[PDB]
């Protein structure tokens, strides 16, 4: 509790590849962990401009910033200063697949995020490789303990510029690097938006708001 | 430190097997695991690998679509479901734990350690 201050900064590094296009992203961010709110600024340092929709990347840049009821153990906050690790698979309806592995630690007072990501089997004419997405709709992640870790499931929806939508099934596993109290099953409501971006999305600012509730 | 493969056997092509590997001596759920196979006279080759969470899997091209790697992080066991078996799948199959606790699509034999004794798979 005393190690996660009410205002926290973080740095993030991502190495990735989508349908063969390789890239690196460096970012800084900040937020109020106990309010469940955060913002980040991200810069494509290698491989820019990206030939794919930024949206598939935005959910990969921070579950330390989730507002939790007092009766729900904040497992991921408790994992610090050691931190936690998480791995994710997003299976999109058109066959596209994104895999992510991530490490979160605490160093010199800030959170350090190391991310690796791979996207594959995205149709060439699909909305991802053609940049036809308008960001994510608000999501509810079903969290539950299992295998000694905290798992999360979500059915997520990307807005399509034609007024339609692009569906994805997301499963994530978060595990503290030290023994900490796991919660019971609950839900986390998440809103993620791109708040600013330059013309070619080589600099992008994001906002996320996350809140835990009972079910 | 201790990996024991089981489930091998002899079947005709088109059949199925399910290899398992029981683990002991380390926090299984923190390590990626890999299946390799070694044919007579040849060197070990990569078959499949699975990250610590089980969400990220990787397969050699020659088995993709036919084989499925999985894991049970409660029982601490690795599995390789083998369907549509072909004669060229005949080999000794061995399981290994990744040396580094940060696997990411690493297929090299040198990226894995603590090898079990293996189990024989023969396909006619």
Which of B72, B67, B74 is CA-nearest to residue B37?
Answer: B67
In three state form, how does the secondary structure of chain B look? CEEEEECCEEECCCCCEEEEEEEECCCHHHCCEEEEEECCCCCCEEEEEECCCCCCEEECCCCECCEEEEEECCCCEEEEEECCCCHHHCEEEEEEEECCCCCCCCCCHHHEECCCCCEEEEEC
Three-state DSSP class for residue A95: coil
Specify the DSSP element, H or E, that contains A116. strand A110-120
Resolution (A): 2.4
Q: Which residues pair with B59 in a beta bridge?
A: B48
β-bridge pairing A186-197 and A139-146: antiparallel
Structure method: X-ray
d(CA A203, CA A158): 21
Q: Regarding beta strands B45-50 and B33-38, do their DSSP bridges make them parallel or antiparallel, or are they unpaired?
A: antiparallel
**Closest CA–CA distance from residue A22 to any residue of chain B (Å):** 15
Contact A149 B29 (CB under 8 A): yes
| Superfamily name and number for B2-123 | Immunoglobulins (2.60.40.10)
A99 touches A171 (CB < 8 A): no
Tokens of residue B82, six digits: 């083998």
Query: Domain locations in chain A?
Result: 1-215
For residue B110, is the peptide bond before it cis, meaning its omega torsion is within 30 degrees of 0?
Answer: no
Chain A residue closest to B29 (CA)?
A147
B105 touches chain A (CB under 8 A): yes
Among candidates B53, B74, B105 on the partner chain, residue whose Cβ is nearest the Cβ of A87? B53
Any B CB within 8 A of A179 CB: no
Q: Tell whether A149 is within 8 A of chain B (Cβ).
A: yes
Is A147's CB within 8 Å of B104's CB?
A: no
Are the C-beta atoms of residues B104 and B40 closer than 8 Å to each other? no
Per-residue burial over B82-96, b = 16 or more CB atoms within 10 Å of its CB, e = otherwise: beebeeebbbbbbbb
Question: CA of A172: which chain B residue's CA is closest?
Answer: B55
Q: Hey, how many other C-beta atoms are within 10 angstroms of the C-beta on B19?
A: 25
Buried b (16+ CB within 10 A) or exposed e, A120-139: eebeeebbbbeebbbebeeb
CB A94 within 8 A of CB A126: yes
Provide, as residue numbers in chain A, all residues whose Cβ is less than 8 Å from the Cβ of B29. Answer: 147-149, 175
Contact A201, A67 (CB under 8 A): no
Per domain, the residue ranges of chain B are 2-123
Alpha carbon distance A201, A199 (integer Å): 6
């Amino acid at each position: 509790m005393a190690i996660i201050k009410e205002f926290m900064r973080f740095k993030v590094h991502m190495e990735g590849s989508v349908n063969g296009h390789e890239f690196e992203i460096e970012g800084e961010g900040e937020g109020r962990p106990y309010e469940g709110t955060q913002t980040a600024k991200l810069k494509v340092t290698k491989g820019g401009p990206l030939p794919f929709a930024w949206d598939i990347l935005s959910p990969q840049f921070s579950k330390a910033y989730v507002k939790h009821p007092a009766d729900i153990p904040d497992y991921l906050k408790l994992s610090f200063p050691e931190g936690f690790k998480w791995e994710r698979v997003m299976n999109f309806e058109d066959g596209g697949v994104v895999t992510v592995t991530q490490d979160s630690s605490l160093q010199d007072g800030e959170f350090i995020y190391k991310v690796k990501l791979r996207g594959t089997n995205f149709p060439s004419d699909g909305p991802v490789m053609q940049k036809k997405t308008m960001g994510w709709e608000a999501s509810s992640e079903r969290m539950y303990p299992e295998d000694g870790a905290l798992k999360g499931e979500i059915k997520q929806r990307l807005k399509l510029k034609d007024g339609g939508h692009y569906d994805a099934e997301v499963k994530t596993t978060y595990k503290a690097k030290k023994p900490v109290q796991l919660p019971g099953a609950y839900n986390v409501n998440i809103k993620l938006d791109i708040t600013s971006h330059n013309e070619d999305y080589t600099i992008v600012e994001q906002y996320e708001r996350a809140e835990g509730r009972h079910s | 430190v201790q990996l024991v493969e089981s489930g091998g056997g002899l079947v005709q092509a088109g059949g199925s097997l399910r290899l398992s590997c029981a683990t002991s001596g380390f926090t299984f759920s923190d390590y990626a695991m890999g299946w390799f196979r070694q044919a007579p006279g040849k060197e070990r080759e990569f078959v499949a690998a699975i990250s610590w969470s089980g969400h990220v899997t990787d397969y050699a091209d020659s088995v993709k679509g036919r084989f499925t790697i999985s894991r049970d992080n409660v029982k601490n066991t690795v599995y390789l479901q083998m369907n549509s078996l072909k004669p060229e799948d005949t080999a000794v199959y061995s399981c290994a734990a990744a040396k580094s606790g940060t696997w990411w699509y690493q297929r090299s034999e040198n990226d894995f350690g603590s090898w079990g004794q293996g189990t024989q798979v023969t396909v006619s």
